[model samples]
Structure formats: structure tokens, C-alpha cells
Target: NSMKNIESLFDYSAGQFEFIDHLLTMGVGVHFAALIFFLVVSQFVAPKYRIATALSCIVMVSAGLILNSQAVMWTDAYAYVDGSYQLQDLTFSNGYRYVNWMATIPCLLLQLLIVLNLKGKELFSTATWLILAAWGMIITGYVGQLYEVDDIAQLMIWGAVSTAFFVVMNWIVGTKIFKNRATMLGGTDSTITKVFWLMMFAWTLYPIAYLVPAFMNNADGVVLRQLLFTIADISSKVIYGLMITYIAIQQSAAAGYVPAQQA
Candidate 1:
């Protein structure tokens, strides 16, 4: 890490300003557009899976609201200095992005649960536990982030706590959800299974995004941070909705629903 002026990174170039500006707004657009996308797609799925689709819409709404606010906050946090936006008195809280995920993440898991149709009391038990774990993981992660600059030790300690919950949560659900492979149309053909694993892979983007701040702490990283967060949102929420809707359509087709069957 060769640096002539570390503080120089604080005063971003004009390109960085527009890059982050466009990214935040695009996040708002993608998420809100997903609300309608999932709504319209729900008609082709079964009545039960419509709830899953609805949950997708809910995630989009939260994301859209948060993304909009994040855009506004970014603008206010930067002052145009000389030829560029400089870090000023007001600072952007990247924490809001995680808070938004606190809403979006659990809902994404719930959407998967609904369409997968976990049986009887297992559904209730598992869903309950999943919520607890997801909440614990995100809440602790946010708490750790608060100490990111002031106390690296606290960030590491709480981040470890958050990571533990993630491990336990994924272990239970991934195993149980895999059991539904046959129930969900079997083998490689099952879109349900595909998205589940895809979601597992997709969600890894978040931790990488989260870890970015620990190493690269600057306005350069501020731009990088927003870029990472928005990409993670699009992949996890919006595109994942498309995959979830695909599974619903497949499920409806198997059940002889006219919208899916006749098509």
C-alpha cells in the first residue's frame, strides 16, 4: 500500500461523485421495479407461492425506501471542494445498508421457505429458528460495524459472533432444504434447488462487501462500499426474485394450474 497522501483519498475526483450518485439511484430503480416484477409474475404461480412472491415484493419495497434515503444521505454527506466532492462535516452511515438487509435478508429466507413448502410443525419450527438466527446475525454485525473505526477489536469480536450465527443458520436450513429436492421436482431440473444454492452463493457477496471497510477506509472505499452494497442488493433481492418466481411457475405447472400448465 504505497500512498503519497492518505488523506488525499478523502477528496474524491468528480468521476467518483457521479459514479456513486448513479449507483445509489440505480439501486432505487432496480428494487422498486422488482416490486412490480414479482407482482405480475405471481399470477402464473400457485396461490400459496403467491405469498412467496409477495414477500419478494416486500423486500423490494424496503430496499427501494432505503436506497432512496441512502442516495439523499450521500449527497448531503459530501461537499463540492475545488473540483470534487470532499468528505465534510456530515458523514454517510453505511449502516443503513445493513439495516435495510436486516429487512431484506430474513424476508428472502422466508420466501424460500414458503415455496419449498416445508412440512407441518417443521415448517413452523424451522422458520422460527431461521428468523432468530438471521436477526441475531445481522443485528450483531451492525453492532460490530459501529465500532469499525473506533475499535477494531470490537468489530472483530462481534463479527465473529455474527459469523457463528450465519454458520449455524445455513447449516440447518441448507440441509433441511436439500431434503426437499425430490419434493420440489427432483435433481438438476429443480429450479427450487437451483435458486437455493444460487442464493447461498449470491449471499457470499455480502460478507466480502462488509469486510471492505476494515481494510480500505477512505472516500475511495466509500464509493467502493456503495458500489458493493448496491450490487449485492440487486443480486440478492431482485434477481433472486426472478429465480424464486421461476420455481413458483414450475410448481404451478406441476399442479395443473391453467396459467402455467396451458402455457
Candidate 2:
């Protein structure tokens, strides 16, 4: 959890610490703003699709809290020793990120399922499996991250396990959840299309960021990895939420809903 491996016993520049802290600050702002966005715009969407925005609001609030906590934790992990930023007794642990995702990943996965409007037994059944898979994905990755400093082999083993779960998630998202693409406003080639691609793209960033430790062993790597994570969070939750909201609005209008159109 500690950034010891990435720091490599080298003192960091104040710039690096400021850069990471600033990213966390902005991350908190972005998520809180997204929460407000989802809440304010809820009335504009159809009641049927409003749950997706509500789910989005939940995710934004959760992410906001996590990001704010990360900002505090990052500062707590470092101190000015002499002229440079050095590790303190309390080191910044990326492990909290895994815990955050334990909350976030399930919500993120299920929101897409909900937005797809699956119902009854199927919804319950699918939600159960998705939640399980999301937990496994996060747990396995957390296990791998724990060994990032000491055991490369353990990292790879857990990394592959996490990847398997991620593949299943992407498969379900692509094949099952998106089967309703035709029912969306613009058909298969519409806005939902962009959301799918963006989801894939944003998700890809995490594994890439996660792997940075295996490749780069320096302060620069630490900075880059955090940067990637901040970007991924915004892309996956904030942008994805807005795209889904747009779909809900468009669908509401198409259904001849009066209040949505007036909104």
C-alpha cells in the first residue's frame, strides 16, 4: 500500500507531491460536480430511466468521498524532510483505491444493468452474478497489488485472475447488456455506441495504470500512475453517467412523455 516501491527510496520533488495532491483535489471536485449534475437533471429524464441517473448520483457521491479521502491520505503519507518530500511513518497506500472500487465497481456494473431496464427474476439474477464478479475482480487485483513491492510472480498471478473477471464483465457488457442497443434512440450506431466504446477505453486505462509499477520504478511512474487513475475515474463514472443521462432524455422524448419534453 505504501508508495515505497514506486518511490525507490528517492526523495520526491515538491512539484510531484503538489501534482498528485492537485489531481486528487480536482478528482474530488469532478465527482461532486457529477453528483450535482445527476441530481439536478433527474427531473428531465423519464421515470423509467431516472434510476440510472440516481445510480450515477450515488456513484458520484461515493467517488467524491473517496477522492477527498485520497487527497488527505496523500498528504499524510509525505512530509518535508530537510529539502525534499520524503515518506513519513504513514505512507500513501494505493490499497485504499481497491477498497473504494469494492464500493464503486459494483455500482458501476449494476447501473448499466439497471439502465438496460432488465427486470424481475432476470434482473435479480444478473445483479447477483455481476456483483460477485465485480468483487472478485477487485479482490484479486488488491491481492496482486499487495505483492507489487515484494513479489512479481504473485502480482502476475493475481493480475491474471483479475483480468479474467474483467473480461467476463466486458463480455457481459458488450454482448448481454448492450443487446438493447437497437432500442436506444439512435440505434446501434448512436450515442450509446460511444458510451460502450468509452467504457472500454476508460477501463483499459486501469490495467495500464496498474501495470506501470511492473515497468517503471521511479517517482515519475508514481506520478503517471496517479494521473492515469484520475483520468480513468472521470471517464468511467462522470462521462459515462452523462452519456447515459442523454440516452434517458432522448428515449423519454421518443416515448411521447410530456414532462420530460417540457423539461
Candidate 3:
């Protein structure tokens, strides 16, 4: 009862920081819950799925995105901006319109490589195509966003073109690649690569589904551009950060550096 009262005292509406705080709180709750559940039932699940525990780290990333994306700013989205939190003024900016060129173009290139299913000896060719195409799109997109009056439309068209390159790549890879034994290595089971690659797909899909649409919705800046812009940035960071951390920690642990893992 006292705890509930104390919780009630906390204001709900603040800027993005409140969203961060919420992610942290929910992450703690989930970690504790998982620990307890594992303690009681780890024995029952297959050893393979035990490593699935690491994927839980992505939960905070997801929460951060959902509670903080441009979608969250929809007409009736949940927010502390209007609640009993001290009334506030927040700064907004549309200046970073060119930023996505750097962020998403590189992302599109990475997705392209995954799509082509390049590996081992053919990696150089794949890298060349990926970088060239990425840089091309980045330069074109940035220039368009910078100099064109119809910046939003330019970006939207380019975003579709670049994203299509990746989407097709995903389809090709999923259908024709990652199956041969030659592609498997380091004495790891096929499931390890499968899970790792699928997680990578999840990471990319989050941006495409959540962040990209936000860009489209605010193309004309009908919405609070800064709010959506900031949310998109944070969401990208969280998803990519979590994805890297997940892979790095697992690989490091497998390589016998549990202490050096990202935790």
C-alpha cells in the first residue's frame, strides 16, 4: 500500500527521459522474473534454448522503441507530456533531416549483403557492391534532403528504392542460402547461426516497421518533428545496440571471456 502511494506520487509526463526510466524499470522487473523462472524450470527446457535467455536483453530495446517511437506520438498515444508532471517546454528541430542518410543508408547496405548471401571468398565482391550502393544512396539522399524543397518526397522515394534492394535480398537469402554445410563453421550448430541471423532480421525489421513509417508520417512535418525525430534516433540506437551486444556477449562467452562480456 505504501509502495503504491509512493508510485502514485511520481509524475508520469516528462520528456524522453521518462521513457528511458520506464524501460529501465520494466527491464529490471523482467530480469528478475526470468531469473526466478529459470531457477525453477531451467532443468526442463532443452539446453539449446538455454542460450535463448540472452535474447531477453532485447526486451528493453523493444520497450524503449514502442514507448518512444513516432508512432507513440499518434493523436491518442500514451504520454506524460500532458499529465500531472510539471508542465514543460521541449525543443524541436527539423535540421537533422539529412541524418537518416548516414544512418539508414549504411543499414540498407548491410541488409543487401545479407540478402546476396555472400560468404568466404565471395565476400570481397559483396562488400564492394554493398559499400558502393550504400554510399551512392547516402550521397544522393543527403543531397536531396539538403537542397531540394520537396525533401520529404525525395527521401521517401529513395528510402523505398534502397529498402527494396534489401527486402529482395532478404527473400533471396531466406530462400536460397544459409543452408549449405559449407556456410556453417567454427564447430557451431546450425541453430546458432539460424538464431543469430534471425535476430539480425528482427533488428532490421524493427526499424522498417517502426521508425521508417514515422519518417513517412512526418514527411510534411504535420507532427512534432523533433519528437518523432528524437524517438527515431533513440529507437535505432537501442535496436542496433542490443543486437550487437547480444551477439558480442554470446560470442565472447563462447570464446571464454564471460567476464569481458557486455553483460
Candidate 4:
């Protein structure tokens, strides 16, 4: 009987329910730690990178805390049929995740832009396109979850549109713009390139996770779906943010840092 309390704590049949909850909470904690680390050490960074580091930390903390706080709303719709609970036609409501995406994705894109220190019209144009693309991706995702039936035609169309912009964002900004900037620095293997590729690889998984629901029954696929998204969030935000700080510090130590605009 002593174990009754322990059993009760974990006895929910929705195995992925508690698991997702805990995973998200842990993600929050990890990013919170990242926030503290960056803020404390940012003082020591060269003026050029100090602002970028602080901004990255703020973005990470915001994503973690905001995502976790919104988790209660990420419920799969349900209905009753024949006196039993039935999964509704829509697989789930993920507006929360999309909302968080709206915030984090732009911030993440900005982090790279600031570090590169692009000039004038090129900087403004690139940042605007990337932010718009990020917004397009999430807005479509939110709309997709709004449908009661599995009609994902709108989702797919918008996904393609957003993806085209993403391609432009990556190739034009990441490769053409960022690569040239890094080449100018002559530190090709530095943390900037490493973090850039890492963020790209981690972000590619999000679209795959978004499309997973259309292929399987929601009841059978919910756990795996949630797991995939949770893993992506941790990798993209927490890990990505830490890597940004690491690169910032390394660049500063090499005397390659620029003075912060207001510093």
C-alpha cells in the first residue's frame, strides 16, 4: 500500500501525457540555466557579441518558459460516441507550439544576423524575408490544426510556400551571406559555422514532425508526435542558444569582436 502514492503518480494510461509534460518542464529548466549563464558572462564578452549573447539568452528563456506555460492547451480534441470517448477528427490543437514558434524562430534568425553584422539594405532585406517566412510557416500550422477533419490541403500548400522562403532564407542568407561573412573572418571552423549548421539540421526535423499527423491515426500516433516535437524544441532552442554563447565567447577571445552599438 505504501507504493500506492507512487503508482498513482504515474498510472495515467496516456503514457505520453506525463512524459511530454515532464520533458517540456525540463526543457524550461535547461533554458533557464542557459539564460542565467549568458547574462552573467555577457559582461565579459566583447562589446560586439555581448548584445547578441544577451539577446540569444533572452530568446531561449522566453521560448522555454512560454512553451511550458502553454502546454495545457495542447490537447487533442475528444468526443463521446456510444457512451465511450472517441478521438475527434482533428488530431490535436497545437496553437501553443505555433505561437511559440512565432517568437523563437524570428529571434533565432536575428541572432545570426546580428553576429554577421550585415550592412544597410542587405541586412534589412534578409532579416525581413526570414522573419516573414518563419511567420508563414507557423501561421499555416495553426490554421491546419483548426480544421476538424484531416483535410490538410491548406496546410500543405502553405507549408510549401513557407518552405520556399525557408530555402531562400537558408541559401541566400546562411550560405551566401553568412558564408561570405565568416570567410572574411578567416575562422571557417569557428563556433559560428558550427552553430549555423547545427541549427539548420535541428530545424529540418520540425517540418517532418509537423507532417507526421497526416500519415497515422491520431490516437496511435500522438505519443510519437509529441516526442518528436519535444526533442526538436530542446535541440533547437536550448542547445542552439548555448552554442551561440560559446561561439560569441570564442570570437571575443580572438579579438575579432566588434564594439556593441550602445556599449
Candidate 5:
């Protein structure tokens, strides 16, 4: 509790900005670059895996859902100055987290299918799994903080414990699946479009979640929620919206460009 009185704690804005600003340095740059690079390297393989871009996009969304939930939960225990550092939960039950999940299902499943149907190596890599595990902690923290009890923590602890029960399952899938990274990462156009729409649909959840919670809670939480939500909303949605817009423009260009080439 003494941590609360220290300038480090009382200066919520400084702490708040410092926290998010550091996250942004990673989220805005390296994360995006890695996803892009994965897609680009994947492109060299074939058409099927090209959708890694789309898949990467959706994975980012999935990660966002997990992180947003975690961030929202963080505010329950820690009081921010003037309530300036509240977190927003973007999960489906929060409003349309379900709809967003639905939108993402087809694409996610399709990626799963590709990862599964292909022969040698297992679907996701260990590096990927480890990163996701770290995110799971964030999700757990948020969930625990939001519910006012340790319910979310229970889930987090259990999730880690139970993961081992499936180790044998992992052994089977790992050894059986082929490692034709090239094919797995290439040749999938229809797969890409499926993923694209799914990502677009899922992006709609944030606005609904934040707006509904704001209207119901009144002035107290309004400013607090807005503080973080706006940053998250802008940081996230802008990129997705722009990406969707770019997709449309490329389609339009192709529609006319083909004609010009033929003529």
C-alpha cells in the first residue's frame, strides 16, 4: 500500500503515460514489423500461405482481445489519479465480443485447417506459443482485477497446470505434422479473403463495448474509461480500418487494371 503514496504511484498520469507509452513503442513498431516480415517471407513459398498477412492481422486481433481484457481488469485494484487510468475490456460478453469472435471464427478455423491439413510440423511454433503464454498472463491479470475476486487468477493458474495434460497430444501432433513451411505459408487465396472479412468483422467490437459501458455507468467512469479506450481505440482500429480500406482499393485497381492490360 505504501507503493500508493510514493510519487511513482501518485503521479498516475506519469505512470499511466509511461506504461502505455512503453507498450506502444513495442506494439506500434516491432510487433507490426514482425507480423509483416512473417507474411513477406511466407510469400516466397506459394499463394496458399500469402494469407499469413490476413492471418497475422487476425492473430493481432486475437492478441488485442486478450490484452484489452487484461488491461480492463488492471483498474479494479489500483486507483488512478482522478481515475485517469482505467482499462477497457473488449471481450464479447462485454457487448459484442461474441460477434467479433464469430466474425473471426471462420478465418481462425481456416488457418487451423491449413495448419492441420498440412503434413509435417505442427501448426503454431513454440516461439509463438511462448509469446501467447505471456499474453495469457496479461489476460489473467485483467480478468482477475475486473471480477473483484481471484476467479480469473484461478483460471490462469489452472490453465498453466492443465497445459501439460495435453503434452502427449502435442507430442502426437508435433511429430505427425509435416514441416513444409513453404506450402503451409503459401497458395491460399480463398483462405486469405476469409481471414480478411473475419478481421474486419471483429474490429467492430471495440466501439460497441466502450460505448455501451460508458452510457450505463454515467459521468464517473466516463472520463476514466475514455482516457484509455480512446488511446486503444485509435491505436488499434485506425490500422485495421486503413488496412481494410487498402484492401478495397487494391480490388478496385485490379478490376480496372486488368481491363487496361487486356486492351
Candidate 6:
């Protein structure tokens, strides 16, 4: 009996997936390192304000870990089809990624609220807007990923909606909140203000990353997309967490807050 050679069925190179796998594996390590740093350092935060740092680290790091794992899973979901290694369809439903974002994005927004110490009506209003926007962006993104055909116009419509929310969220946190905090910490020259601007810039890259696939012809860009997404994740989640922790520690120390010793 003649058996069709499996290797003969494909024209794609193994190098593509190999490189993606390497990137995803490295991403896991990077995420874990940041998480550990956050947890270990949180112990030094004064008891009165420890909750802010502790919770921020808990949410952001946990999300980073899950998101990295999901990226690897998405890469693994590739199927060999029609002489190439690809997903079943051009507009594949990225269930893992969508789910991961839906869960983590809210936590991210909540972390911001906690770190900023939003209160009363302002807190409630901002939290509501941020959480809703997170859901809006994620849900629309999920919808876009599920399209059977490459529907750039539909995707852009949703993308625009998400971008509006993104802009508003940044405005609320960056200008409305961070500005006041900046003045409190050290005015225009404050490290916290610098960190806030840095975070905002890094975060803006994510929406751009989301649009990369729409421009590409196929999954060949998976590695590039993952690499860009990974970079953004590390910057937004890890570097941003470090900045938040630094600010929390400084503020607490200035206020004479102290951590309670463990028995």
C-alpha cells in the first residue's frame, strides 16, 4: 500500500512555528519574573496602603501570566491546511485570546482605580466607564475575530468604538486623575507623572497590535503579531506595575504608613 507522505503535503517551513514557539516560551518566563517581583516587593509596602500595591500586583501579574499562556495556546492551535500551516479559516475565532482579554482587561482597569485611590462619585463614575469600556473593546474585538471573511470595514467600525473608549479611559486616568497625583507627588517633574505618560504610550500600541492581522494576508504574521503583543504586555503590565509600586511605596512612606509584622 502506498502511503501519502505527510511532509509532502505541506509547502510551509517549520522555522515559522519554531520561532513563534520560542517567543511564546520566553514570554512566559518574562511574565513570571515580573509577577514574582511584584509579590515579593509588596511585602515591604506599609500595612495601611499595602492593599493598593498588593491588589494591583495580584491582578496585573496574574493577567500577564494568563495572557502569555494563551498566546502560546493560540500559536499551538495552528492546523496544516492546503499546503500551509494555518488556522482553519482566515478569520479564526481567537477564543483563548478573547477570553483572556475579557477577564484581564477589567482587572487592569480596576488595578488603575485602586492605585490612583479614586473615591466617592468620581471613583464610581470612573470605574463604571473604565469597566464598560474594557468590556466594549474586548467584546467588539471578539466579534471581529470571529468574522468568516476578512471584513476590514466591520472590524474598523468596532475598532473605532474601542478606540473611543480607550481615549476616554486614558483621559480620565491620565489627565483627570494622574495630573492631580503628579502635582501631589512632585508636580510636572514627578516620576509618577513620567511613568503615567510612559504607560499611556505603551498601552496605545496594543490597539495597533490588534489591527495587524487585518492588514496581513495570512497567519504568517503570527510571529510578528505575537512579538509586538508580548512587548506591549511586558511594558504595560510589568513596567507599569513597577511604577505603580514605586509610587505607592513612596506615598506610604511619606505618610508614615508601616506594615504589620507576620507572626
Q: Kindly report which residue pairs in candidate 4 clash with one another.
A: 47-260
Error of 2 at 37 (Å): 1.1
lDDT of candidate 6 over 1-263, digit per residue (tens): 00111111123446776666676667677777776777877777666446656655565556656656655554555666665565432222335556766665666666556556556798788778877877787787666544413466776777788777777767766775544564333122276567767777787777776776566534455556667877887777677777777766766656555542220
Ten-residue segment with the worst summed lDDT in candidate 4?
A: 1-10
- Candidate 3 lDDT by residue in tens digits, 1-263: 11111121234335443453444344445434443543443233233333332333333333333433322232122234454343132221122233433444344334323322345556566555555655554455444333223344665666566565555545543443355424422233344345437444543642343233234442223223334434443433333433333333343445555342324
Candidate 6: lDDT of 2?
7
> lDDT tens digits, residues 33-82, model 4?
77887787787678766777877777877777665664533333333345
Superior candidate under TM-score, 1 versus 5: 1
Best by TM-score: 2
lDDT of 2 by residue, 1-263 (tens): 57434543457889988998999999998889778888998988788878888888988988888889878977887798887888785656778788888888777767676656677898788888878887899999988987777887888899999999989877877776457766555342267667788999998999888888799867888899999999999999898888878777777777777767786
Candidate 2 pairs with clashing backbones: none
Assess each prediction's global lDDT (C-alpha) against the native.
Answer: 0.76, 0.80, 0.39, 0.63, 0.38, 0.61
| Candidate 5: C-alpha lDDT | 0.38
Report RMSD (Å) for each prediction in the order shown: 4.0, 1.9, 12.2, 7.8, 13.4, 6.3
State the lDDT at 23 in candidate 1: 94
Model 6 alpha-carbon drift over 4 Å, by segment: 1-12, 64-93, 182-189, 258-263
The residue-by-residue lDDT of candidate 1 on 196-239, one tens digit each, is 67777777777776666678887777677667777777878888
lDDT of 5 at 51: 56
The TM-score measured for candidate 5 stands at 0.34
lDDT of 3: 0.39
Sorted by lDDT (best first), the order is: 2, 1, 4, 6, 3, 5
- CA lDDT of 258 in candidate 5? 39
Looking at model 6, residue 232 earns an lDDT score of 81
